[PDB]
Design a protein around this nucleic acid. Sequence first.
RNA 1: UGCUCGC
DNA 2: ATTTTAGTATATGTGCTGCCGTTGCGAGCACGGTGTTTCGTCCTTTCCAC
DNA 3: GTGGAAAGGACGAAACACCGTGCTCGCAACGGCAGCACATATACTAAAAT
Lengths: 50, 50, 422, 50, 98, 148
Amino acid sequence: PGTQMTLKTFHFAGVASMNITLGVPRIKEIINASKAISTPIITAQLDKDD
Amino acid sequence: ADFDGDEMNLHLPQTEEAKAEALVLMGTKANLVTPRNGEPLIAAIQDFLT
Amino acid sequence: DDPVVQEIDVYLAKSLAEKLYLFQYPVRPASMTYDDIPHLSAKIKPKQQKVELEMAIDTLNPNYCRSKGEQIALNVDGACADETSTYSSKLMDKQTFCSSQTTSNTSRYAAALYRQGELHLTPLHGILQLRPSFSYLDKADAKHREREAANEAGDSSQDEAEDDVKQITVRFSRPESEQARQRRVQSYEFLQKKHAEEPWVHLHYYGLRDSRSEHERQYLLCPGSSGVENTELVKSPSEYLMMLMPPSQPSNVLSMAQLRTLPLADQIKILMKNVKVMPFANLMSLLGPSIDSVAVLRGIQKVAMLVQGNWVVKSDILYPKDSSSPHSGVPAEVLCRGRDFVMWKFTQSRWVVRKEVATVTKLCAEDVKDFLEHMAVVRINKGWEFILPYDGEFIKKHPDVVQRQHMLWTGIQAKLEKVYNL
Amino acid sequence: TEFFFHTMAGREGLVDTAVKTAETGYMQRRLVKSLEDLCSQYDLTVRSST
Amino acid sequence: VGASVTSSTHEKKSRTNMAVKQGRFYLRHNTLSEDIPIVIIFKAMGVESDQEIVQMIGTEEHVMAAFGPSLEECQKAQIFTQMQALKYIGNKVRRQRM
Amino acid sequence: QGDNKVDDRDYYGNKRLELAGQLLSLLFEDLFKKFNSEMKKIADQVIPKQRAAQFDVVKHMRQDQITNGMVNAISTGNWSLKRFKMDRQGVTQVLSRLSYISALGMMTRISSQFEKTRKVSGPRSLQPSQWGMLCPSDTPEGEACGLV
RNA sequence: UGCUCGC
DNA sequence: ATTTTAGTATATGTGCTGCCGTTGCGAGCACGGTGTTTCGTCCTTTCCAC
DNA sequence: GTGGAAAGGACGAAACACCGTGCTCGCAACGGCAGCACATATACTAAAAT
Ligand SMILES: Nc1nc2c(ncn2[C@@H]2O[C@H](COP(=O)(O)OP(=O)(O)OP(=O)(O)O)[C@@H](O)[C@H]2O)c(=O)[nH]1
Ligand SMILES: Nc1ncnc2c1ncn2[C@@H]1O[C@H](COP(=O)(O)OP(=O)(O)OP(=O)(O)O)C[C@H]1O
Ligand SMILES: [Mg+2]
């Protein structure tokens, strides 16, 4: 799938911002298990989400 | 492959055990599906679907 | 947009041509001036202009730190030496401004004094930029070095008489290589020493508030009448443009301007070689109306022939004696004979058959095609037609030339009937 | 202008694929060199070479 | 965001760079042991007044605000004349192997 | 340092094209300087100690130096100029005689300074500056895509 | 060793 | 004798100059191979005299 | 047409080290995980004043 992956763009995951590394660079950063990665994302849930 | 000048290799085993292992494990009829997700790769193609 | 108002006259003055200098302070705004600052002296050199102003600054003003003044004065000079002191008192009292030369030549710069209805211009002998020089710190560092040497010598209270007799260390005046000699000449120390070789000249300062300023200010003007026709400054715009912009020093290689720079005969020859088909009026328009028609006619009669009122370049002009056919390699004489036969067929009839010419001249298809394309176009169901229409005006205007070309074509026809057995 | 923009897009795709080939080749080499030791034993437990 | 200039004549080609690694501009060249502040080089090249240097850099408020740290670092040292700056530069000069 | 108006290297307005003329000029200058240095060395070695028979350069002007230098630099294609410290390779290439179009297109080729060994993907893009100057579509498909 | 190619 | 300051002592924590990688397989071709700088032995060829 | 002696040109050959002289450049191709130097911060401990 790495060869099958096209390394596309514009995939902001619905927020139209916050450029995140996805694709072969993302898989490489995951498999390398580096302590510091590029563009770290943390999803936090709220007690009062409304 | 796309039949636009691709060169492919063809090897001949020199052992009965190797020949049997190739025919059994790497048989075309026994590898109709990829181990990635089980989807069949050997199927109809252009001029066969149409 | 006419010059409605302000027709100001411009006068020139040579009284202060060699005595006018421009001093600009890049670090001092125009608001604050040095009119109230009492100056003390000005060092200057006639050659290699570099003026150093030495002025005095007040001390009792609240904008001066007397403690730091005493400190810097003790640093730059000695305790009570006063033999060569940058300051007379124990405080920083004198300030040095050093000049840097902007450009070597200042002939294109001029000072303009404006009076009611007139503007007087005066050339500038030199322009220098005055900046506050930091030279007392260098002497302070030198004095600190000599004080360090004194402290080194004073390590012991009583110093024995040193037997440091100067052994004769006279070095060889080695013959210096030309590269090393050029390096020494181009060195900064050599240039600075050469500049220092010129003796200094001391000058007093006269401020703007002094009466001498207003006295000598009148020298920028010149005695002369209001309206005087200048003897010089009378060159035409073309001459001025030539002055301020001095010069550095296929067969269609030569351009139109390079053509017009050539004699008329060469112009006609090159034009007939390039176009090979053109009327007389077009040639007169291209060469120019300033050229007489008789000269152009005599020139074209030597390199062209008359076909149906038009002019076609001669065969030998296109094909020199040493040339050959680029397609078949046949000698140029056969090409000239074939082209003469084609032109004769065109003079006899406006329509020419390619197959007949190929059969008579015994030439290949490509040579006949090249001969026809130079003077004909393909008309369907009619063969080859002459590219230009019948020009009867030139024929009516010059009957003698028509008769000359007719007898020349008669001779050419006789030669062609003798050769090709027509 | 449209042809020039289309050629720009095509060259961008070409260079993207050119980089992707080598990047995924190196990634595949690393992944296979790391994962080639594992094997499924007869006791239904996946064990390494050691 | 730094700058680089590859000055190439018929004889020598030298690429000199300028960096802002610590809010101040340092000039880096292959002939210098350590990059030196740009204000020291300004003082070494004839112009010694800091006001003239600031005027040459620019008169915009943000320009002065950005160039302030360089002036402060220059004033931290005792480099105020051309001779001192030239000596400081020469201290950062290494001989081309004897 | 404020608005990110960073200049781009791929802008061809800042690019320069060296033909065979400038390269041959630099090579001939280097070879002539080497020949002059060799002649000066031969003079320094021969004149002061040989004999009353006066030394002349004509007996030592080797004619194979410049010829061999030019031949090797043109054939092998590697240019090593110590006076300029330029070490280039692949300057000359064998003319392809596959067809007339092949040679005609190879005659107007242009190589990049990047000298492809890695995936730069920064000059390989088709910049709008190539309008009217370079062909946008003509490029070798493969590892040399965008740099030739 | 270099380089042009073939996917 | 006890609380405050000086030192030292190691550990830790942020750099900055090192070493290591950079798809695959295929097919052609051109060039150059370590040499060269000066010393000497050998062989040959041709300045005048016969 | 000939010859005894002379020079010089070419091909082995040995001392030294790929560059005539001793100089001399640019550029990093881009990350990225080890690090080792420094540096230096802080606290622990013990000597000194009250
Ligand atoms: N310049 C150059 N170097 C070459 C050439 N062939 C080989 N090399 C060098 O030799 C190395 C590879 O050697 P091979 O090609 O295996 O030599 P080979 O083909 O075994 O040699 P043979 O046994 O004579 O066929 C490379 O690192 C090159 O630097 C050539 O034709 N030119
Ligand atoms: N560098 C390479 N590495 C691996 N495989 C390659 C390489 N170059 C070519 N190939 C082979 O050629 C194939 C590439 O073809 P592909 O890119 O899918 O079509 P294409 O060349 O874009 O054709 P179109 O331009 O779409 O008509 C796939 C691969 O097996
Ligand atoms: Mg294919």
